[PDB]
Amino acid sequence: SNLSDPITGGHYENHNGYFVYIDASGKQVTGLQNIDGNLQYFDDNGYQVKGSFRDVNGKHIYFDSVTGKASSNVDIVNGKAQGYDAQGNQLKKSYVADSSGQTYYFDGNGQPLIGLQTIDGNLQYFNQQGVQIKGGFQDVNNKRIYFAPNTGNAVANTEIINGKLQGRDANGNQVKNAFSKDVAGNTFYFDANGVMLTGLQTISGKTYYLDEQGHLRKNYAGTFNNQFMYFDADTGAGKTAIEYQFDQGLVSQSNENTPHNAAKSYDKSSFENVDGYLTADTWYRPTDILKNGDTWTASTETDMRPLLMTWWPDKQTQANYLNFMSSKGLGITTTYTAATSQKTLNDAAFVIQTAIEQQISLKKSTEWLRDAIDSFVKTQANWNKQTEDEAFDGLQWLQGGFLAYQDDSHRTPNTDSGNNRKLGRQPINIDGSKDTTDGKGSEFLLANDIDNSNPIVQAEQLNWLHYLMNFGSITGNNDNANFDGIRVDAVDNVDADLLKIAGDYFKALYGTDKSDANANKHLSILEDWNGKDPQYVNQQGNAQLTMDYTVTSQFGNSLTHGANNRSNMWYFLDTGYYLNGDLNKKIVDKNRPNSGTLVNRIANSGDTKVIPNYSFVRAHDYDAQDPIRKAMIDHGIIKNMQDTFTFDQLAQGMEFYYKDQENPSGFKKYNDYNLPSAYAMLLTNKDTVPRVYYGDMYLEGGQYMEKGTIYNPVISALLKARIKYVSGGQTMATDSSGKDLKDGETDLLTSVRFGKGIMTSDQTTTQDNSQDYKNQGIGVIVGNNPDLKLNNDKTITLHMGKAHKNQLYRALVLSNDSGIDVYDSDDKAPTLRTNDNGDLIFHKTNTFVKQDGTIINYEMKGSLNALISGYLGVWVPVGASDSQDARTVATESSSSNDGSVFHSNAALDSNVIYEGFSNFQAMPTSPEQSTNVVIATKANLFKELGITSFELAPQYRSSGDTNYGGMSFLDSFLNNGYAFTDRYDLGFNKADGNPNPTKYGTDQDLRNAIEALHKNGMQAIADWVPDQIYALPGKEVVTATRVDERGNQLKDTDFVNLLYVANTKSSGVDYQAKYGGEFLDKLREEYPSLFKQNQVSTGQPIDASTKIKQWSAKYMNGTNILHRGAYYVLKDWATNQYFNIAKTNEVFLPLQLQNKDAQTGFISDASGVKYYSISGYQAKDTFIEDGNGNWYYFDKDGYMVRSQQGENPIRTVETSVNTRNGNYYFMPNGVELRKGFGTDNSGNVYYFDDQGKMVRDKYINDDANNFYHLNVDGTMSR
Ligand SMILES: [Ca+2]
């Protein structure tokens, strides 16, 4: 178990080059101590010991030289070596490696073994001091033995004696007249004189080829005797490759059972199917049924049987089916291989059929068989994800990989999109001009990706958008229960036309381009992560607000992420904005490489036009999802981030996450540092709409608003202070000039706001002579160094401005060693008065006086606790009225002719968005505690924090645990609303009348929540989620290619243009059917131009001429891989045609099923070799694999390709299956060379890969460390 009980909550300190550990108590630690799972030791002075042994109790414990952690070592004790484990026990009969990477083996007495030894059946050598010889020869006994580099085990090896290679075996004896290897893995042959042989050699009646170096060449084809010869993969022995290796002659399969097992009918009646095609788990209606295994009786429509009882795609599958069903008690357990004769396999299928009919009679059911078939099917690579090339790079990380659907009118016309499906039309690639680069958008994200490039689908997205912005009017005839603005989810993963469609809709219906008051009545945001999206959005007129990741990113590097090494606060300034960082001169740099922060705040007087934006520190999807899961992983609750977790599992993890977040130590493993300081900056910045995350205010798990966070009071104060004081111009500075700090420099950031009409440091009074400014403005000081101590001389200054000369200021918020104090009003806080120039001066030590109460002492000291790791001071002017409001109302006048919607100014800055949900909330324990019920009772609270818009979670009904194939995502099983089946169901009752809330409550709860926010003068934001939809219940057959997030075919995939069963069709009787397209006709009549205006990506306008009441594949770009297999849709290998039964004039079935004679096997004729598949058809223009694993290609004429004498064996193949195109090497018996070198008629050597294709223009490596190069023309330079 444990040598010492663990301790937590104490910091490590370093004194005089040594680590000390100080307890939670504040006590220095001596002796052996398990601290946070690591066993460590401190001597009597309290210093930590590293790379030395210490004696505690009966244990001799070594501690590591880097970490000081207890680990195994060997100590020379008195005269002798003795091994020790991590717990300090002398080891017996065990290997141990010491500090220097040497290995000993200690015996029963603890004494190391010396000399030659056999251990666990391994021969090893030890030097006279007991050390293990590794990676060298050694003359023990008469003999000479080589010992392996890591194991130290005896192995054959070669060395160069004099000038000639010699071979040494495992026993240390030289090798004479035999094959022997070397450590690398090369085989040589050594003659009677000991000397290695070269070239072509015949020994023991067999011929081997040794190259110039003497290496035995296996799986090597070439013309050695002026006649072809292929050298074996097993032993390298030469075969003439004249003998055919296929073991299956042409045989007829028809017999007495064929007419009985044939299909009753060739159509959808007698065959289970998808769009006419058949699947591996298809059941069919045979003409007759061998009831009970005795008597054949005509079948009744309900007597369905599995196709795999009677037919198989190939012999391998047949043999596997037989072996699998056998193991389940259905007959003699059989070891069948593809090599087993076809007659034998078919006979064995029938004894299994008989047994099947017996267990059907015995059980009076077929469900046991459904489960047996289903299980067997998943076993086969062609019918599972093994042929789907699961990958996790990029967005594939979420669900394991994507399939892009194709326009294929010949095979899958229902699924044809009518030449739509333009992928990756993100803002920067809206016109496809970056399709060949990484600037093509990652169109595929999650689930079923909707084709937003299709005009018809674009119209439907507008219908949905109308439905949300009139939700209340339509669903409750309540014109006060309507959403006011939107958030556009996943901007970079959809067609950017949607932004224009949304923008123009808002223009038409609300005149958002007419005034700031109209625009700001419908606050709308974008989830737009690309670093070039801000500038796009601004070119297109800011119809929705861009995020400002530049500021969120800098919070990450300078405050929020990591215990120690953080970027300086200097980086917030982006001094590069000005030429030569001339803060003195302030000349703007007109021509920089598109870099830096979106809005400069060094001296922002409102004089330069800037891009309007929202900003945040954290989000429901930023710094939440990963930490919450890392916490679960760290405590063994789940293994992987994509792992499925239950709600209970989430709750347990959440308890650790909370413990870490509130940790008094001040260290955070999963959670973010300095959130209060980050909000202090977020909430005082000019030219932004800040957004506040629910999960920084309340705890992210459990019930909605169940418990506030420790940050709540500080952030609540900042929010109320923002209403009272935050207006006017801004400045921002740091006691720093770059990455590195000079002697006095603290790297403390100073951010100031001046008051309503005050735009600069030196401005003394407003132009309009308003006095509002005097009691407004704010001062913020922040640091990222919890070990910050000022020099005695040093002074830190807030330039509150020449509009605030001689004024008294009081603290709103001040940090200290146990927390951050919050001062709710002037009387309770320390005051400090500004000088003649308007500066508040601060020293290492300060003596502040309260306005009436007392004298206060306060040090400018970095602190470390749960609320901060650094410094935070905020100061406000005393004398602020109780109802003082510094905000600017938005003006109804047409201020701008620029065409733009949003404008960054004091009015827009007066808004605050509250993102009011967390993805990790628990499900409501009762209807009364549902989020939207709570929001209604609590609307008041947010009015007083200055929230002007409430961003509600997506209200769409969760797809839940439903999972038709593939990886489920956390959105779905956590019911957060981002994963949904029905876009229009926002919590309606079941059709039987029973309640059916979402995670957030019923549809009435939502309308009440929205109204309540309007009664308190707040807007409601709808989450618009056009990228995807989950768990569609209806199957269709699509043509699919395996693709990465950008829709580019994976480099090494056979999955190209294959038929696949996907879940793409909606129920048709859901709320998408009720409300789909219903509002478009009214909209076209009222606002024609929306439907006549051309969209950029398509050159076309949106098309409301077709309505979408039911989703189906034709409106989709693709899906995450569904784990069904590349050939779950059944196909004949010979002709490559897929089976179908939809229309009687174009039926294709295996011939057995139509009571015709199916012949199968290889048959020679005067012209060449032919092959017939199990379904009875001739192989033409296709690759075919025999029962022994050999591959062949059959040409257009139906003949196996084979090399002729004196002619080039390399052939260029062009097939119906395009992926297989390439240069192949076929032997005289037609076998394809794979994973090996092949000589042409002229002596040039080429290499052919795992699948037989020639490899060109690359270096190729070998298991024995041999390197070769292949030229562009294919030849091997080597
Ligand atoms: Ca997409």
Query: What string of H, E and C letters represents the secondary structure of 222-283?
Result: EECCCCEEEECCCCCCEECCCCCCCCCECEECCCCCHHHHCECCCCCCCECCECCECECCCE
Same domain, 855 and 777: yes
Strands (E), 635-727: 689-693
Give distance in angstroms: CA of 274 to centre of ligand 1: 26
Within a domain: 564? yes
801/796 Cα distance (integer angstroms): 15
Three-state secondary structure string covering 325-389: HHHHHHCCCCCCCCCCCHHHHHHHHHHHHHHHHHHHHHHCCCHHHHHHHHHHHHHCHHHCHHHCC
Same domain, 150 and 64: no
Contact in structure between 714 and 867 (CB atoms under 8 Å): yes
954/812 Cα distance (integer angstroms): 36
* Long-range interactions of 164-167: CB distance < 8 A, separation 24+: 164/195, 164/196, 165/196, 165/214, 166/190, 166/194, 166/196, 167/194, 167/196
Q: What is the DSSP string of 961-984?
A: T--SSS---HHHHTT-SSSEEETT
Residue with tokens 């199968």: 1160
79/81 Cα distance (integer angstroms): 7
Give distance in angstroms: CA of 450 to centre of ligand 1: 6
Give distance in angstroms: CA of 496 to centre of ligand 1: 10
Within a domain: 314? yes
Residue 871: which of 986, 784, 966, 995 has the closest Cα? 784
**Burial code of 1074-1084, b = ≥16 C-beta within 10 A, e = fewer?**
ebbbebbeebb
Q: Which residues, 6+ apart, have CB-to-CB distance to 556 below 8 Å? A: none
Q: Which residues, 6+ apart, have CB-to-CB distance to 883 below 8 Å? A: none
Give distance in angstroms: CA of 1029 to centre of ligand 1: 10
**Other CB atoms closer than 10 Å to residue 1041's CB: what's the count?**
21
Within a domain: 865? yes
Give distance in angstroms: CA of 462 to centre of ligand 1: 17
Within a domain: 337? yes
Same domain, 803 and 873: yes
Same domain, 303 and 375: yes
1149/1137 Cα distance (integer angstroms): 10
Same domain, 596 and 728: yes
Contact in structure between 895 and 903 (CB atoms under 8 Å): yes
Give distance in angstroms: CA of 441 to centre of ligand 1: 9
Give distance in angstroms: CA of 466 to centre of ligand 1: 21
Give distance in angstroms: CA of 989 to centre of ligand 1: 31
Give distance in angstroms: CA of 488 to centre of ligand 1: 13
Give the end of a domain, one of 71, 101, 125. 71
Polymer length of the chain? 1278
Give distance in angstroms: CA of 925 to centre of ligand 1: 35
Give distance in angstroms: CA of 528 to centre of ligand 1: 14
Give distance in angstroms: CA of 1112 to centre of ligand 1: 15
Give distance in angstroms: CA of 639 to centre of ligand 1: 29
Give distance in angstroms: CA of 35 to centre of ligand 1: 48
Amino acid letter, 1228: P
Give the single-character DSSP code of 66.
S
Give distance in angstroms: CA of 1038 to centre of ligand 1: 17
What residues form DSSP beta bridges with 1224?
1211
611/357 Cα distance (integer angstroms): 74
At 468, give phi and psi (nearest 5°): -75, -45
Resolution at which this structure was determined, Å: 2.8
Give distance in angstroms: CA of 323 to centre of ligand 1: 44
Contact in structure between 1045 and 445 (CB atoms under 8 Å): yes
Q: Which residues, 6+ apart, have CB-to-CB distance to 269 below 8 Å? A: 285, 301
**Number of separate helices (H) and strands (E) present in the chain:** 23, 68
Give distance in angstroms: CA of 493 to centre of ligand 1: 5
CA dihedral (780, 784, 789, 795) in degrees, to 10, reads -30
Give distance in angstroms: CA of 432 to centre of ligand 1: 15
648/254 Cα distance (integer angstroms): 59
Give distance in angstroms: CA of 451 to centre of ligand 1: 7
1151/1167 Cα distance (integer angstroms): 26
Give distance in angstroms: CA of 957 to centre of ligand 1: 20
Which SS3 state, helix, strand or coil, does residue 833 take? Answer: strand
- H helical segments located in 523-673: 533-539, 549-555, 625-634, 647-661
Give distance in angstroms: CA of 422 to centre of ligand 1: 10
Give distance in angstroms: CA of 491 to centre of ligand 1: 9
Amino acid letter, 414: N
Within a domain: 1218? no
Say how many domains are in the chain: 4
Contact in structure between 719 and 692 (CB atoms under 8 Å): yes
264/283 Cα distance (integer angstroms): 12
Within a domain: 466? no
Q: What is the CATH number of the domain that holds 49?
A: 2.10.270.10
Give distance in angstroms: CA of 1055 to centre of ligand 1: 21
Give distance in angstroms: CA of 1026 to centre of ligand 1: 8
Contact in structure between 197 and 173 (CB atoms under 8 Å): no
484/503 Cα distance (integer angstroms): 13
Residue 153: which of 175, 133, 182, 176 has the closest Cα? 133
Give distance in angstroms: CA of 1045 to centre of ligand 1: 9
Task: Say how many CA atoms lie within 13 Å of 1019 toward its Cβ.
Answer: 21
Contact in structure between 613 and 598 (CB atoms under 8 Å): yes
441/460 Cα distance (integer angstroms): 22
Amino acid letter, 383: W
At 92, give phi and psi (nearest 5°): -125, 135
Same domain, 810 and 890: yes
Give distance in angstroms: CA of 1117 to centre of ligand 1: 7
Same domain, 173 and 274: no
**Other CB atoms closer than 10 Å to residue 669's CB: what's the count?**
15
Contact in structure between 1210 and 1187 (CB atoms under 8 Å): no
The tokens describing 1243, both together, are: 């002596």
Which SS3 state, helix, strand or coil, does residue 676 take? Answer: helix
Same domain, 297 and 363: yes
288/264 Cα distance (integer angstroms): 8
622/627 Cα distance (integer angstroms): 10
Give distance in angstroms: CA of 444 to centre of ligand 1: 5
Give distance in angstroms: CA of 467 to centre of ligand 1: 22
Give distance in angstroms: CA of 495 to centre of ligand 1: 7
- For residue 366, give its domain range: 251-384+1127-1154
Give distance in angstroms: CA of 1047 to centre of ligand 1: 10
Contact in structure between 954 and 976 (CB atoms under 8 Å): yes
Give distance in angstroms: CA of 815 to centre of ligand 1: 46
Within a domain: 698? no
Experimental technique: X-ray
Which SS3 state, helix, strand or coil, does residue 587 take? Answer: coil
The tokens describing 453, both together, are: 């490039």
The tokens describing 897, both together, are: 């002719």
Contact in structure between 146 and 155 (CB atoms under 8 Å): yes
Q: What is the DSSP string of 1137-1162?
A: PBPB-SSGGG-B--GGGGT---EEEE
Contact in structure between 1150 and 1175 (CB atoms under 8 Å): yes
CA dihedral (556, 562, 566, 567) in degrees, to 10, reads -20
Q: Which residues are annotated as a binding site?
A: 443, 449, 493, 1027
Give the single-character DSSP code of 892.
-
512/1053 Cα distance (integer angstroms): 49
Same domain, 141 and 20: no
Give distance in angstroms: CA of 1027 to centre of ligand 1: 5
- What are the distances in angstroms from CA 932 to CA 691, 938, 1187? 20, 10, 64
Give distance in angstroms: CA of 996 to centre of ligand 1: 29
Angle at 351 between CA 350 and CA 352, to 5 degrees: 85
**Other CB atoms closer than 10 Å to residue 402's CB: what's the count?**
29
The tokens describing 740, both together, are: 């590195």
Give distance in angstroms: CA of 421 to centre of ligand 1: 10
Give distance in angstroms: CA of 950 to centre of ligand 1: 27
886/877 Cα distance (integer angstroms): 13
Contact in structure between 594 and 569 (CB atoms under 8 Å): no
Give the end of a domain, one of 906, 941, 970. 906
Same domain, 67 and 117: no
Same domain, 137 and 280: no
The tokens describing 1160, both together, are: 């199968």
Angle at 532 between CA 527 and CA 536, to 5 degrees: 80
Same domain, 883 and 807: yes
Q: Which residues are annotated as a binding site for Ca(2+)?
A: 443, 449, 493, 1027
Give distance in angstroms: CA of 492 to centre of ligand 1: 8
- What are the distances in angstroms from CA 884 to CA 342, 362, 725, 1057? 92, 86, 8, 67
Within a domain: 162? yes
Contact in structure between 833 and 809 (CB atoms under 8 Å): yes
Element (H, E) at 15: strand 12-15
Give distance in angstroms: CA of 630 to centre of ligand 1: 28
924/947 Cα distance (integer angstroms): 25
